[PDB]
Symmetry: C2
C-alpha cells in the first residue's frame, strides 16, 4: 500500500473541514473570529463554500496587518464591512458600509497537487521548489493542505525504521 | 507590462478552442475524428464542457493503441461505443452498445498552474521538474496549455528585457 497525497494531507479522516475564506461574501468580523479561534499560518481562498474552487492563499500575518491598518483610518470600515479579493467590489444594497479590498495580499498562484499524486512526487516538489505549503485537490475542487512541516514529519517517520524509500530522497 | 501564464498559453486570441475529451460523453468515433484531425501530443480530460474541471491528461499514442486493440478484441466495441475515464460506466439508455473503459492510460496527476502565474516561475518549474507540459487554470477551471516547446519559443522571443538574463 503506497502512500499518496490524500494520506498525508489535513484534515485527516473524520476531522473538521479546512478553515477557508471566501472571495466575496465574508465580513471583517468573520475573518476576525477565524483569526481568533485558529493558529494556522495561512488560509485558502475559494469562490464559495459550495463550489470549493480555489482562488488563492493568504497569510494570517498579512490579514492581521491589513485589518488593523483599516480600523485606524476610521473611514467607514466596520465589523459589518464586506471583505473581497476580486478586482471589483461586489454589488450591494443601500445603506451598507464601505467595502474592504484585500486582493493585494493574496497569493494568486498557490501550488496545487491532486489527491492521487504519490508522496514520493510531493516530497520531490517540496525539495526542488522550496515550497512552504501545497494545496490538494480533486477534479478542480479543494480538499486539503500539506505544509513543509507535514513533509518533514512524513520523512522522519521513514528515517528511523522501508528504509530504502527514505534513501530515494537523495535521488 | 509583466508577462504572465495567460500570455503564453494556447489557445491565443485568434486561435480555436482547446481540444478536450469528456470523461463520460465521447464516443469512439468522436475521439477517432479527433486523432486524425489533430497532431497534439495529448489531450486534457474534463468532467464536462460546461464545468471544464480537470480530471487528467492522456497521450495520443496511448489512445491509438488502446482504441486499436479494443476494436480488435471482440467485446463487441463499435463506432457508437461510449468511452469513459471514471472507475465505472455512466447510466446508459436501454438499447446501447458496449463501452470502453480507458482509465488505465489516464495520467491522474498532471502538473497545473494558475493563469496569473509569472512566466519566470513557469520556466523555473519547467527546468527543475523536467515537465513535458503544463496545464493552465482560472479558479479551478481549465483555460489552456503550455508545452516544453512553447517555453522555448518564449525564451527566443525575449532574446532580441532583463528577464531573459535571469534564466
Ligand atoms: N488551514 C488549515 N486548515 C486545516 N489544517 C491546516 C490548515 N493549515 C495547516 N493545517 C495543518 O495543521 C498543522 C499545522 O499547520 P501550521 O501550523 O499552519 O504549520 P505547521 O505544519 O508548520 O505547524 C499541519 O498538519 C498543517 O498541514
Ligand atoms: N490538446 C491541445 N489542444 C489545443 N492546443 C494544443 C494541444 N496540445 C498542444 N497544443 C498547442 O498547439 C501546439 C501543439 O504542440 P504539440 O504537438 O502538442 O507539441 P509541441 O508544441 O512540442 O510541437 C503547441 O503550440 C501547443 O501549445
Amino acid at each position: 500500500h503506497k502512500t499518496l497525497a490524500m494520506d498525508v494531507m489535513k484534515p485527516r479522516r473524520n476531522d473538521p473541514l479546512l478553515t477557508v475564506l471566501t472571495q466575496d461574501s465574508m465580513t471583517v468580523e468573520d475573518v476576525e473570529t477565524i483569526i481568533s479561534e485558529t493558529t494556522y499560518s495561512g488560509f485558502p481562498v475559494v469562490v464559495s463554500r459550495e463550489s470549493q474552487r480555489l482562488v488563492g492563499f493568504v497569510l494570517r500575518r498579512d490579514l492581521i496587518i491589513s485589518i488593523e491598518n483599516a480600523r485606524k483610518k476610521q473611514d467607514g470600515v466596520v465589523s459589518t464591512s464586506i471583505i473581497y479579493f476580486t478586482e471589483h467590489s461586489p454589488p450591494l444594497p443601500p445603506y451598507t458600509p464601505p467595502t474592504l479590498k484585500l486582493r493585494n495580499i493574496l497569493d494568486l498562484s498557490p501550488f496545487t497537487v491532486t489527491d492521487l499524486t504519490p508522496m514520493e512526487i510531493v516530497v520531490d516538489i517540496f525539495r526542488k521548489l522550496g515550497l512552504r505549503q501545497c494545496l490538494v485537490t480533486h477534479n478542480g475542487r479543494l480538499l486539503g493542505i500539506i505544509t513543509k512541516k507535514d513533509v518533514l514529519k512524513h520523512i522522519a517517520q521513514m528515517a528511523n525504521q522501508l528504509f530504502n524509500e527514505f534513501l530515494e530522497v537523495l535521488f
